[PDB]
Amino acid sequence: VHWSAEEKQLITGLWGKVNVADCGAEALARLLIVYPWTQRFFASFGNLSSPTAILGNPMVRAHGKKVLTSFGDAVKNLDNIKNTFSQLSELHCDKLHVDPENFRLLGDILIIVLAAHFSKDFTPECQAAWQKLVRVVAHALARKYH
Amino acid sequence: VHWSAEEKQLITGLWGKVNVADCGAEALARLLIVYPWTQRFFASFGNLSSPTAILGNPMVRAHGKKVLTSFGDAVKNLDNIKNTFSQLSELHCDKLHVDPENFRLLGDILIIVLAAHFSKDFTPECQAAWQKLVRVVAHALARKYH
Amino acid sequence: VLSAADKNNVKGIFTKIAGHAEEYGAETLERMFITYPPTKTYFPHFDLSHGSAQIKGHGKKVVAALIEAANHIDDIAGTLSKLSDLHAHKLRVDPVNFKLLGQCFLVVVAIHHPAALTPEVHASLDKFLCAVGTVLTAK
């Protein structure tokens, strides 16, 4: 994948304004709420019995921050995403057996969370660049299946 | 992907008995009949207006033989699938814009056609090896999207 | 299968959508065409430059059909029955595209009504959009 000058500027520029802890918690909670079968991977986190319980669950919020933080490791060097995510690919494919369609669903949820956070600053062009980024990260995460 | 000696044996052994022309024609016909939106990519083939017309369509039959023939080029060199299909990837991704979900659907259909053609000789272990093969070819066909 | 809470959540947020059909529909299409460029292949007859009149007119019709499905949320297949024939039989829209449009619509709703698009409302709106997609692909 090639990154244009504009795409890199749209991604790094928005990233500096992201509230990693808040957006990360929101994205992970929406995944568990919008796509509830994903809750099967997170029984260790405890009470996921309602949207309220999920949104207020400390382990969910803690985990969302870690997930968005790794997205930031993609933002930092966009041309090395494959290697950056290789160990996480082993975890999700060889160990957890998460179907990669779920990587796409978390990426789409994150775009909606970013839209909610940035309102009209999340231009069509910015959405297009961030959708590209989440698709490239999901591809890198699925690498160990192939 | 890594190929076990048994998987190699199951794949090369079944391939030698495949009726490339008949199986290929039947797989493409079923794609167009079972998943009719795929007919949008094949208007150059003329009459696709009914199951009868599709199965009797000379260009459909000829194209299916070409498609299954390329699957044979993967059988011949299982460790080089990525490079064998690189030019076909440019065609399907950059030029035709076929969504890769449809590559999966064609593969699943081919498995069902091979089961019909081989009956109980299409063991569970054979199916697992051939499902792996169509999954790897579909991954190689989608390379140019990333 | 839309639950009773689902229908309540969908009609609730659709009260803010009504009256902005043209603006939200035009923005949903522009987002789809730039985020997912291959979707433009269904519209070769369109002027697809930003702000074109065909996009604004088409966007309005798309959101108007959604609002009509919301007002008849108990029977979506019947409300959108002739649209199914157009998309599945005549247009041959690949089913993956209805997820792309639905994604773009939720993005528009989040941009303009983030407080209304709570996780529960997002979940219900996702089911509604997937049901509409099922109808429009059912040939």
Place this chain on the structure above:
Amino acid sequence: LSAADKNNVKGIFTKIAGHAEEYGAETLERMFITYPPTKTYFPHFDLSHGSAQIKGHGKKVVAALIEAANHIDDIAGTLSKLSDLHAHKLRVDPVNFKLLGQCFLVVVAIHHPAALTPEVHASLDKFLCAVGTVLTA
């Protein structure tokens, strides 16, 4: 589901009805072998070849399908209890219903290939997608 579709599904299932345990057991064995991650939903099962739990469970899966066939006009109503089990209790990822349906169609093609015409295949795919949608609700 069209009327031709309903008749097409009823048609092959007269060949299926006699062999619910046999075809159900083979459908599951193919799923576990072709898609090994599907075994994580059955940690309580003996999953060795020919085990009694697979044969027992395979008979129930196909018997549920036969009941959906015998009540094809309201399948959601005939399989209502199974939705809560699969979606709420088991949290089966919806991708797995496509894998099992694929294995079922492979079993049908192996045993009744002339009956699995392209048109019957089309109708059975729509039937299996509808069942999967009901079990994921």
